[PDB]
Amino acid sequence: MREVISIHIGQAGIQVGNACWELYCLEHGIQPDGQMPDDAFNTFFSETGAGKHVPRCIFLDLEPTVVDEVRTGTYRQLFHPEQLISGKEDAANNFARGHYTIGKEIVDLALDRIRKLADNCTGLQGFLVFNAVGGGTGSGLGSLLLERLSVDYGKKSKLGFTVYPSPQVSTAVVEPYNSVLSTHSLLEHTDVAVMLDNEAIYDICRRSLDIERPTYTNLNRLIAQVISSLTASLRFDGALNVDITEFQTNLVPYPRIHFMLSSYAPIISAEKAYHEQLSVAEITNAAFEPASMMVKCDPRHGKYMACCLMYRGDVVPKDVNASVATIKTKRTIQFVDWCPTGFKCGINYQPPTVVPGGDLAKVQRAVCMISNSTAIGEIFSRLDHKFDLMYAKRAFVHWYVGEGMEEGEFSEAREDLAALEKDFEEVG
Amino acid sequence: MREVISIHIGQAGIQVGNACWELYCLEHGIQPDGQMPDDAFNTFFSETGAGKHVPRCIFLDLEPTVVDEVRTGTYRQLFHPEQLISGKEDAANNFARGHYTIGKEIVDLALDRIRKLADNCTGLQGFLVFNAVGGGTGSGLGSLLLERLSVDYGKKSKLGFTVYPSPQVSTAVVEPYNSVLSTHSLLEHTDVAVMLDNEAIYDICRRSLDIERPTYTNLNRLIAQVISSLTASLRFDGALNVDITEFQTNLVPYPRIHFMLSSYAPIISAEKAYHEQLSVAEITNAAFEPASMMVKCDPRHGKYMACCLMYRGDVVPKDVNASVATIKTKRTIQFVDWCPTGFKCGINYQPPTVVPGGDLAKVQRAVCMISNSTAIGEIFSRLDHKFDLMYAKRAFVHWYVGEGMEEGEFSEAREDLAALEKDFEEVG
Amino acid sequence: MDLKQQVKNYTMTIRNTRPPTMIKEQDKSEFSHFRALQVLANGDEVPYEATLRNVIHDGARQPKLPPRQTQKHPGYIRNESGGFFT
Amino acid sequence: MREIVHIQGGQCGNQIGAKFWEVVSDEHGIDPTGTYHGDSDLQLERINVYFNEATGGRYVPRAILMDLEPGTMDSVRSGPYGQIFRPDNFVFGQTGAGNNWAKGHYTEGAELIDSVLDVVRKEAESCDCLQGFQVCHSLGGGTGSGMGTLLISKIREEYPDRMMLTFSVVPSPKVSDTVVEPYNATLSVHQLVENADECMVLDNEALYDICFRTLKLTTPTFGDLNHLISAVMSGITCCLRFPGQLNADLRKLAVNLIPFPRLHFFMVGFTPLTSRGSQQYRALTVPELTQQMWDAKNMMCAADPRHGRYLTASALFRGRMSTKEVDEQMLNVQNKNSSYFVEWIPNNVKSSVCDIPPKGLKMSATFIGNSTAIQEMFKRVSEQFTAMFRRKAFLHWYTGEGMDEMEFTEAESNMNDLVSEYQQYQDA
Amino acid sequence: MREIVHIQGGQCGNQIGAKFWEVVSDEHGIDPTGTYHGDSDLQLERINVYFNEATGGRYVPRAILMDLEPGTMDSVRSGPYGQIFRPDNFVFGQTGAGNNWAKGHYTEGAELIDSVLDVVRKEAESCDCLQGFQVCHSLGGGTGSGMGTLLISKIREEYPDRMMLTFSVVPSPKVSDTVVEPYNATLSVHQLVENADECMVLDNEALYDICFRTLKLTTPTFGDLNHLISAVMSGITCCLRFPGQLNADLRKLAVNLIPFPRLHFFMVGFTPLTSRGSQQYRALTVPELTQQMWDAKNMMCAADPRHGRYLTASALFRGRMSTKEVDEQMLNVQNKNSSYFVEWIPNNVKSSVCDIPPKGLKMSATFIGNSTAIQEMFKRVSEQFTAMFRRKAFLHWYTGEGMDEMEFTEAESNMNDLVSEYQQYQDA
Ligand SMILES: CC(=O)O[C@H]1C(=O)[C@@]2(C)[C@H]([C@H](OC(=O)c3ccccc3)[C@]3(O)C[C@H](OC(=O)[C@H](O)[C@@H](NC(=O)c4ccccc4)c4ccccc4)C(C)=C1C3(C)C)[C@]1(OC(C)=O)CO[C@@H]1C[C@@H]2O
Numbered sequence A, B: 001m002r003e004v005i006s007i008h009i010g011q012a013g014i015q016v017g018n019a020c021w022e023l024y025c026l027e028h029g030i031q032p033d034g035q036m037p038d039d040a041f042n043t044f045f046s047e048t049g050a051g052k053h054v055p056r057c058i059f060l061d062l063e064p065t066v067v068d069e070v071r072t073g074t075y076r077q078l079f080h081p082e083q084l085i086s087g088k089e090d091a092a093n094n095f096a097r098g099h100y101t102i103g104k105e106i107v108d109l110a111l112d113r114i115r116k117l118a119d120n121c122t123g124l125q126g127f128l129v130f131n132a133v134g135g136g137t138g139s140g141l142g143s144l145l146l147e148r149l150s151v152d153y154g155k156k157s158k159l160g161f162t163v164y165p166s167p168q169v170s171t172a173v174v175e176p177y178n179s180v181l182s183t184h185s186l187l188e189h190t191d192v193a194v195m196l197d198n199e200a201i202y203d204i205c206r207r208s209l210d211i212e213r214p215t216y217t218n219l220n221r222l223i224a225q226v227i228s229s230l231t232a233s234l235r236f237d238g239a240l241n242v243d244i245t246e247f248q249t250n251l252v253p254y255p256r257i258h259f260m261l262s263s264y265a266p267i268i269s270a271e272k273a274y275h276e277q278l279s280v281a282e283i284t285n286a287a288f289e290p291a292s293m294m295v296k297c298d299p300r301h302g303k304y305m306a307c308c309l310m311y312r313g314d315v316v317p318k319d320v321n322a323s324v325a326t327i328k329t330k331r332t333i334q335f336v337d338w339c340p341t342g343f344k345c346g347i348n349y350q351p352p353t354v355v356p357g358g359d360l361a362k363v364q365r366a367v368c369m370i371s372n373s374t375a376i377g378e379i380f381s382r383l384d385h386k387f388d389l390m391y392a393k394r395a396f397v398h399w400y401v402g403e404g405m406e407e408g409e410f411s412e413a414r415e416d417l418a419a420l421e422k423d424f425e426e427v428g
Numbered sequence C: 001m002d003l004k005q006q007v008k009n010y011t012m013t014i015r016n017t018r019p020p021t022m023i024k025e026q027d028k029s030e031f032s033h034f035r036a037l038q039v040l041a042n043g044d045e046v047p048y049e050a051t052l053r054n055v056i057h058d059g060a061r062q063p064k065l066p067p068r069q070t071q072k073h074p075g076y077i078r079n080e081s082g083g084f085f086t
Numbered sequence D, E: 001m002r003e004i005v006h007i008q009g010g011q012c013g014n015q016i017g018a019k020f021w022e023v024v025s026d027e028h029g030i031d032p033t034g035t036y037h038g039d040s041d042l043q044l045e046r047i048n049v050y051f052n053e054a055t056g057g058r059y060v061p062r063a064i065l066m067d068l069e070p071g072t073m074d075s076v077r078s079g080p081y082g083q084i085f086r087p088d089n090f091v092f093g094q095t096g097a098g099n100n101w102a103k104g105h106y107t108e109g110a111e112l113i114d115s116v117l118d119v120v121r122k123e124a125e126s127c128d129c130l131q132g133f134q135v136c137h138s139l140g141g142g143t144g145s146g147m148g149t150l151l152i153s154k155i156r157e158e159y160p161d162r163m164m165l166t167f168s169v170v171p172s173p174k175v176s177d178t179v180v181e182p183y184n185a186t187l188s189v190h191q192l193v194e195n196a197d198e199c200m201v202l203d204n205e206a207l208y209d210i211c212f213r214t215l216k217l218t219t220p221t222f223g224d225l226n227h228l229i230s231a232v233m234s235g236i237t238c239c240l241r242f243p244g245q246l247n248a249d250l251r252k253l254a255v256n257l258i259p260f261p262r263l264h265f266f267m268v269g270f271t272p273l274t275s276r277g278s279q280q281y282r283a284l285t286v287p288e289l290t291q292q293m294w295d296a297k298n299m300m301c302a303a304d305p306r307h308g309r310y311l312t313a314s315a316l317f318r319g320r321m322s323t324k325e326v327d328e329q330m331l332n333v334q335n336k337n338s339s340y341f342v343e344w345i346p347n348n349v350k351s352s353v354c355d356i357p358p359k360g361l362k363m364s365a366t367f368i369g370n371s372t373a374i375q376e377m378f379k380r381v382s383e384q385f386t387a388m389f390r391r392k393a394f395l396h397w398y399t400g401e402g403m404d405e406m407e408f409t410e411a412e413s414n415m416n417d418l419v420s421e422y423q424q425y426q427d428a
């Protein structure tokens, strides 16, 4: 009835996919061996002819090493090996390798698997992308994929959770290049785009959970909680349910501005949780705190074009409209003039689940926030500077023009970065 | 009342027969010793005076080195030795040695084995040939035999499952020569002729069953499955029972055009069988896949003059009506104007039976798609090319003219192909 | 087809008409072995070969060629897309 | 059926025949006493191709041993495998050959052929379906060349339909153990071309290298060289002897290799070939066996393949393997080295395969190739001949046997005509 | 996939590879008998990168050992792990090197290249997905410099797409174990720049200090120097061999390190490193690992990074840790000594990590940096070259092999241009 197709490209995508699909199989009683001892899982699973539940995901990569780990990991009895895709060679952080040379010869395999995956669903809500901008596979292939998707469906909605090159912490050297080439090529195809950065979540681990040893696992854990709270309306009951259709239309006013931030609350260990009572207000207050964001973007330098709140657990709608009224009275928050409204709130009755051996704690209340603000152009501006800072020197370019690219794409993508940045200014 | 005479000429013919007659005794419980512990086997057997069931087949060959293997294999108790014919010398890949010098002296023998076998059958549905084009026996002899058949019966139906010389993979240097000669003579004699080749099935074992070491014994098990699902209605019940007469009238609109492709689905191993549901929509889509064909032809390079479907297992007639409606909607598939219909379907309630030691897995559903498409003329154009590519040099011709042949037959076999090729173009 | 093969087929027809009775193609001293074992049970003095009994079967031709392993190491070859072989 | 009679002319031919009969006698597991002591039934199914029954359960070879100077026939009788030959299968004369092709082919040959023909007729009629003949020449000496050709011409006009092989050892281009050697070579060739169907050519010089580089032998005696000729000579016929998923009779090897009646000089190679050390590390797979066979070193003839293109080739495998691998291997090789083959021949390799490997090994193969590289060999000799014939050196011996000069001039021109034909089809 | 082929040239190269192939052979838990005796599956998961399969479950290294004067190849074969090398992978010539680049590259080069190239192709096909080459040099000698550059040029013209790493050891500024040392150096550098992608330059001087100060070694043999090079050479490929939350193929290191095609001369270093005493005091934490590698001693090449400027850098960690630590560590250094880095590159470092630690250790790291301080080396050698060339010292030796003086002039100029390039981007 109501189903989603979760895609995981690049290294980070198949990393978080291990976390989310750990969470879901845990939340619904699904054992690692396919079966559990309706529609509560059909949004994420397909009950086979008998017993087994296969997760309706897909894992794409050009490095065999990680998808091989899932094949030998505990969750090999879940994924039809038709889903786990790999490649003999990787992209090596070159956009053209993931986009022009190697990407082209394998998408026919992916779209085959996807065509085999959409026909099973009777009502397809939309695709769910987990991209990793800054690499050759995530940026190069992911962009190449979305074009193949929009030429196919178009009418379908495309949602994207992409990690964005953090300004300070930079594990790569060339990631401004392929990121620029990605954003341009993806924009006109994705209908909405959410971006998150690892460095912000690192700070989140420090203040709230207080873990001085944050690994890629813990970060992947938190994303699972966010998405589990989002899809909560799709796969559960609760007053003011939300679906992707009405969710997207009340959040993207203009076709270009679909770039949005996120936030989650509460985020607390098992000890601070005992000395707390967790009223809805403080959760919503923390959810609007700029520090509690997952991006290194300050919203207090722009305005909120719209906002959406997905609660969880025991909440009553009168507590919601009261707490939100505590926000719209505050001065530290700013909104654009052409929207008196801007809050699409949703409630669900199933509390958040916790993973044994995980970092979160058992709480009966939970809130995730997604807002569209014009301030995001600030972190967009940094990538604007860094590109020409190295493009004038034409550094690393001999790779691209040697890997089946030219110099126009640098200039062509360059203009649309300028073009987008002005659009974020025209809304002022 | 409803029985068939299965002939096996040449090595590949009797090899495939060693799999078909392996499958049937298991499909009906017949032990390797002739006897199990009505009409469910009469189509493929004939109970003796007491106990034993002999398979109403004929194993013919000129190379003794392989028939003598069945003569000592586990399946010797099945066959009466009067069936298994041999010969002191073989044809040695020469069409003339198979059709002119050697084959002329043993047809009278086999013709009496048939005459001793047709009389036992009350209602003779039709013969069932297993030709292997590319050799001397299958081509030279098999063609000489069918001439002797049409002068006897004429009104009877002569089928055929002829392996064709694959374009890329080929284990003979002269086989473009004999292939042309065989078709020039079998065409005006047979009435319907299935076509296939090896490499198209080699890939299927790599794509679908994922066995890196396929041998001739693996392909032979898959040819066994094609026929069983084809002939089940001759021996089993089920809605829309299909008979060779009603199978033939509505698939060959013109006398010359009778060649056709084949396909089968599902084709999956055991582990891929548990992460699935195998809906009737899945199979009919997999069946219509140009990669699931058994011949290296591109159907999208032509249209479908007519198609046919023999389902199996648990099906209901409405969904086929639904799925076939979905197929007529897609645009990749084409149909010539003068055929609005083109789907003569069929069901049986007996599932496909798997053989221990086999590569397939147990499925409660299956589809075998046969269709006469005008796209097949391209593979005829290959042999159309290689022939003149060598006949220009008159290479190897000294064997043929040295073995009771002349140049006339080559030129006369030549014209028939060009005439046949234009016929595939006259339909558009 | 010819004289030699017709004689061959007649002998094979006889083999099929007769029941093979799952025979062992060699018969050793059955009751002598039983009697010797009973003599050993109490008298406690029997020749070794008298105690022994030998039975043979056809087994097969093809004298135990070593296995081909039918499969590489799952670190070298991958299916079409990354994936083991089975 | 398919029985074959075996002839050995000259000293060398009688010596390698002592190994060929010693290798095969162990393959089918018989004793130097002539009694069988194997274990399986495949040792007995097609034993009649190489032996005749004897009283008391003995097996004697269907061999003929022709050579003047019976001193050599005491040697082979005294070897550990001399007791299996019927001591009346020994035709000889007290007078010497003297390396004079004339007397070996005019005077002292005519005195024995009437006796030899009496012996070959006796056991030509000892075969139910005689497949063909095969000899063992040495184009240097007078017995091998002189008597062999005279015998062959006699057989041809008596058994035209049958096929004559020839494992003639050619002289060496660099090494000349005799001095009148080119006279014996050219004069024999004037006989073989019109009076044979397949003629392997082998040179001891290449046999020394193969024993030196690959086998790492320090002192290759003539036994080791003979041990290699024995190896291949058995590899040609395993189809006739053993079961095979794609059996290859000798007549079907002919038609697949000699497109024109005169181009019947082949080029042979065996594999695997390793030392005792490398045997520990190398693994036995189809890839190893096909790259080694397709190498220019394994060619036991003193000809360079890279100076020519394969008109046609053929590989014979024996050992439980997968037919798909050998099917694509010959494809890839046909693709990459597209300059090493011809254009008017689409597929110019045949890949037979047998089911039973050699005695102690588990996989093996044999390479046979009809390349235009052999034209080098005849070019060389045609100089050494025309060098001395220009000076009439040593020619008085040849006039001493009623010969003339026309015989030489006609003979030389026959090769120049022949090697001319190897150039026409080598378009460089 | 990602199988890497290894070369060992010269005395040193043949000698360090003895350690390299000894260290890794114990990492993956295989014995000198070639069979595996580790404990985990992981040693088998990516074992394919360094080895080939063999009969009886053995693994032989995919290495090629080439050197004139085969005396030393007896040493490694008598070494405790010489039994694992394929004895066909031993190319040698009896005539010595003579430290003459010409004969090492003009006369004696051509004699062995045809042999070597037969070897390199013989196992280049053995790789399903060949990642790249890697080679161990010595620019002082005649085999190392001469042969390798000649060999490298040939490889580049048949595998141009792949990458050619180079672990070349450089001549010493202060020490000259030979006399004509700069000549072979320049004549190799004129070849390295054009036919390489990454060139690690190392000098035994800094290898002597690092042995002296840190490890407190009294008497370092060459086995200890090579013990270090083995470590770092085993430190690069932990990504291709082992899991990692952020893996790094060579091709992504190359793109992330050379912005221009000619700045491919690098600088390496290992971490940690400590005597037995302080190892009982020191604690293993990521701050320890990063200061020790960023220091100006650990640089195995005889260059001071403080005199130049880091164009790019990278760090490869192995051991369970928190990657944010690594992330913030590299951020600190880019801030503090901000003058040792460039401006037109925002983040000029790459921070990799592997989840698998060394055998007995638990945490370790490796440094790499492309600084312009390396031009100091090419300054030194240019003086030594121009001093003797000004007077044509030892020059007749070079002209004795067909060489002329122009090749010295351009080779000089190429370094002059090269060192000029390292000046431009070194704006002090
Ligand atoms: C432990 C093991 O496997 O030992 C092998 C062996 O190591 C090698 C080196 C063998 C060995 O061969 C030699 O040493 C040799 C010496 C001179 C000339 C030729 C060979 C072997 O003798 C050869 C012998 O092979 C056979 O028996 C073949 O089936 C072969 N036999 C004979 O030729 C033969 C005949 C009569 C008496 C003895 C041997 C054969 C080939 C074609 C058709 C029929 C039979 C075997 C397995 C071995 C040894 C003993 C070392 C090799 O020979 C063959 C043909 O197998 C040499 O290259 C192969 C590769 C083998 O691995």
Ligand SMILES: CC(=O)O[C@H]1C(=O)[C@@]2(C)[C@H]([C@H](OC(=O)c3ccccc3)[C@]3(O)C[C@H](OC(=O)[C@H](O)[C@@H](NC(=O)c4ccccc4)c4ccccc4)C(C)=C1C3(C)C)[C@]1(OC(C)=O)CO[C@@H]1C[C@@H]2O
Binding pocket: E022, E023, E024, E026, E027, E215, E224, E227, E228, E230, E231, E232, E234, E235, E272, E273, E274, E275, E276, E279, E358, E359, E360, E361
């Ligand atoms: C009780 C204990 O912890 O002993 C250590 C040890 O104390 C020290 C001093 C080791 C030791 O190393 C040395 O003494 C040494 C001598 C000359 C040159 C280089 C090292 C050690 O030998 C080294 C060895 O390290 C390994 O085994 C690594 O996995 C290493 N293996 C080899 O080098 C190797 C050794 C034998 C055979 C084959 C390989 C390695 C490095 C890179 C990549 C893969 C593996 C270990 C833990 C130790 C001893 C034994 C003392 C050190 O070296 C390594 C390689 O770890 C020297 O500085 C480190 C710090 C270690 O703590």
Ligand SMILES: Nc1nc2c(ncn2[C@@H]2O[C@H](COP(=O)(O)OP(=O)(O)OP(=O)(O)O)[C@@H](O)[C@H]2O)c(=O)[nH]1
Binding pocket: A009, A010, A011, A012, A013, A015, A016, A062, A063, A090, A091, A092, A093, A094, A132, A133, A134, A135, A136, A137, A138, A139, A140, A163, A171, A172, A198, A216, A217, A219, A220, E245, E246, E252
């Ligand atoms: N928060 C978080 N970030 C991750 C994780 N895994 C990878 N990343 C980030 O992903 C970025 C690298 O992207 P990749 O997927 O490796 O690049 P690619 O597109 O696959 O291109 P190739 O490396 O050539 O295959 C790095 O900046 C990581 O910080 C994870 O598990 N959690």
Ligand SMILES: Nc1nc2c(ncn2[C@@H]2O[C@H](COP(=O)(O)OP(=O)(O)OP(=O)(O)O)[C@@H](O)[C@H]2O)c(=O)[nH]1
Binding pocket: B009, B010, B011, B012, B013, B015, B016, B062, B063, B090, B091, B092, B093, B094, B132, B133, B134, B135, B136, B137, B138, B139, B163, B171, B198, B216, B217, B219, B220, D245, D246, D252
């Ligand atoms: N699918 C399949 N094809 C086979 C098999 N065996 C042989 N073939 C192919 O059939 C063709 C040759 O068949 P044969 O029967 O040996 O030839 P022939 O008709 O007997 O003619 P002669 O060899 O002269 O006796 C070749 O293309 C083979 O690759 C098999 O077991 N399965």
Ligand SMILES: Nc1nc2c(ncn2[C@@H]2O[C@H](COP(=O)(O)OP(=O)(O)O)[C@@H](O)[C@H]2O)c(=O)[nH]1
Binding pocket: D009, D010, D011, D012, D013, D015, D016, D097, D098, D099, D100, D138, D140, D141, D142, D143, D144, D145, D169, D171, D177, D178, D204, D222, D223, D225, D226
């Ligand atoms: N492989 C092998 N070749 C041999 C042997 N002996 C001789 N040859 C070659 O055979 C040639 C001599 O032929 P030969 O039969 O002795 O003289 P003939 O009696 O006049 O025919 C010479 O070229 C020899 O080198 C041997 O023992 N083994």
Ligand SMILES: Nc1nc2c(ncn2[C@@H]2O[C@H](COP(=O)(O)OP(=O)(O)O)[C@@H](O)[C@H]2O)c(=O)[nH]1
Binding pocket: E009, E010, E011, E012, E013, E015, E016, E097, E098, E099, E138, E140, E141, E142, E143, E144, E145, E169, E177, E178, E204, E222, E223, E225, E226
């Ligand atoms: N790390 C290391 N370097 C060595 C070793 N032996 C020699 N070297 C260097 O190798 C240089 C000479 O190279 P060499 O291979 O002997 O000359 P070639 O045979 O003509 O190439 C000398 O300058 C040595 O310093 C060793 O054992 N370990």
Ligand SMILES: [Mg+2]
Binding pocket: A010, A011, A063, A135, A136, A137
């Ligand atoms: Mg990546």
Ligand SMILES: [Mg+2]
Binding pocket: B010, B011, B063, B093, B135, B136, B137
């Ligand atoms: Mg045949």
